[PDB]
C-alpha cells in the first residue's frame with residue numbers, strides 16, 4: 001500500500017494551484033511536492049476525484065512521469081510526488097523567457113512524447129497536458145504532472161476543437177492536440193492566439209474551426225519535419241492526428 005501515516009509529511013512553501021487542490025513544496029524522505037484539498041470534510045465527489053487520481057498515478061512508473069510517492073487522508077486528502085528541481089515548461093518559455101538551444105527544444109519534445117506514449121500504452125488519458133504540468137528537473141529531465149483530470153480508457157489554449165464544442169470528447173487524440181500546442185510553445189516561444197485578448201472569442205473560434213495556431217511564427221531554425229509534425233498534431237479533425245508512437249518515431253528520425 002501507498003498510504004503515508006499522519007504526521008510524517010512536512011508541508012512548506014505554497015507553490016501554486018493544481019487540479020482540485022493546492023500544491024506545496026514539502027519534505028517526506030527528502031523533497032516532495034504535495035497536492036491537498038483544503039475543505040474540512042470532503043464531499044463524496046471530491047473523495048472520488050482523489051481515489052481516482054491515486055488510482056491513475058499508481059499505474060505509472062516512468063522517468064518522464066512525475067513520480068508518485070504516496071498519499072495521505074488525515075488530516076486532509078493529499079497526494080505526494082517527487083519534487084522536481086526546476087520550473088514548469090510554461091514558466092521557462094513565457095515568464096522567464098528562457099532561450100533554449102534548438103536541439104534542447106527538440107529533446108524536450110521528445111521526452112514529453114516519450115511520457116505520453118507511456119500513459120497511452122497504459123490506457124491513460126491525461127486530459128490536462130499543457131506546459132504548466134510539464135516540469136524540467138535539473139534542467140535535463142522532463143516530468144509530466146498533475147493527474148487530477150486523468151482517467152483510464154479551464155486551460156483553453158490546449159483544448160482540441162472537439163473538446164471545446166463538447167458535442168460528442170476526450171481521447172488519445174485530444175491528448176495529441178494538447179501536445180501539438182506544447183510543440184507550438186517550444187517552437188515559437190509563445191502561447192497561441194497571443195494577438196487576441198478575449199478568452200470567449202478564442203473559445204468560440206477554435207471550436208468552430210475559424211482559428212488555429214499560426215505556424216509562421218516558428219523560430220527560423222526549427223526543422224521542416226518538426227513544423228510538419230506540429231501541423232499534423234494540430235489537425236482539427238481528430239482522426240487525422242498521429243498517434244504517440246508515430247509522433248515519437250518522427251521526432252527520433254531527426255537524429256540529423
Ligand SMILES: CNS(=O)(=O)c1ccc(N2CCOCC2)c(Nc2ncnc3[nH]cc(Cl)c23)c1
Nearest residue numbers: 015016018023033034035081083084086145146
Ligand atoms: C503533487 N504533485 S502533482 O499533483 O503532480 C503537481 C500538480 C501541480 C503542480 N504545479 C504547481 C504549480 O503550478 C503548476 C502545477 C506541481 N508542480 C511541481 N511538482 C513537482 N516538482 C515541481 N517543481 C516545480 C514545480 Cl511547479 C513542481 C505538481
